[PDB]
Symmetry: C2
Subunit: 197 residues, 2 copies
Amino acid sequence: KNTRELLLDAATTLFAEQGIAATTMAEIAASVGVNPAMIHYYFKTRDSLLDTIIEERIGRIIDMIWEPVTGEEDDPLIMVRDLVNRIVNTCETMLWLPSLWIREIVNEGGALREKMLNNIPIDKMNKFSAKIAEGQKQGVINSGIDSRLLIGSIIGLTMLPLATAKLRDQIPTMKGLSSEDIVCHVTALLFTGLTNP
Amino acid sequence: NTRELLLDAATTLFAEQGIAATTMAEIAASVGVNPAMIHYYFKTRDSLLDTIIEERIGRIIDMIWEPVTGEEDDPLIMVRDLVNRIVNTCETMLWLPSLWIREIVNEGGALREKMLNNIPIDKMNKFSAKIAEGQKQGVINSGIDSRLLIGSIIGLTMLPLATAKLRDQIPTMKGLSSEDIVCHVTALLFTGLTNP
């Protein structure tokens, strides 16, 4: 059926398992039993494939996480609760996303790092930072936290435990924690912190 | 000291372009030293990595977890001191957040396997026991996990410094200094987003 979509799904899977630099376009085609002549037909250069990953795979994942964000939310605490849920639910369905995030975005030698910068949802992130800062002015949100740095904090608290899941499964006094066991921890930490209510 | 100069050159080049891509001939040439000297101090490529784990990573890991005892009377002072020691170390040694993501967090890392046999399991168990003791007393939130908090603190402190170069290429995200990071993370870990 659709050869282009099959090879893009094969590209994201192989890049998440062993990295971009190590994976050749000949390997991606062979992994789905497709002739390497077809991968160069849909993607002229190696750079053209990465641009399609950023637009038709990464971009679609980034938009579905930040699109329900408006500037009219009446409760900032519901807005963050929903964002945390959408990040963990996306990573639980699309297992390639947390692994590809550390390897190619966070890493300084990542191939998708530079291309990512020109596809950041700056408009909806500014709306999130404005809504959470409005809550700080009203006194319903903690005055000590930073409205801009909170985006990074939420991403770090949700994405990193799933990316390091295989690593903690190897540490003796650390193994025995699920996707549900982690989301409870992040929600309890973001809302109440360490001081008991 | 040629040995120390080449070890500083090794950690810098591995943080900039990775281990797999960096040759021992490139490390020696980057400091104007003959490649005959790097094989003199480090017999194998594996010996160089073991020295990085013992004399560079290990020293950094020990100085962050050594002030942690089991006798802390206040668990929140213990977490704010830990946060301060992580950010202060990363601010002085810029290669640390970079080398952490590239070779231990990453599944294809060269230091990943060697790091497992140098984890401060004893002092981490003391941290998890002290924070769990606070949960029993009812002074610490019962909802959070004593073991997962270690990862949470590492994630809240290490990741913003690892993504600093990425943030710097964003206009609306530019300006946030290192002192701004430690204040946000402390206010988030202590009180969270809610107010009474």
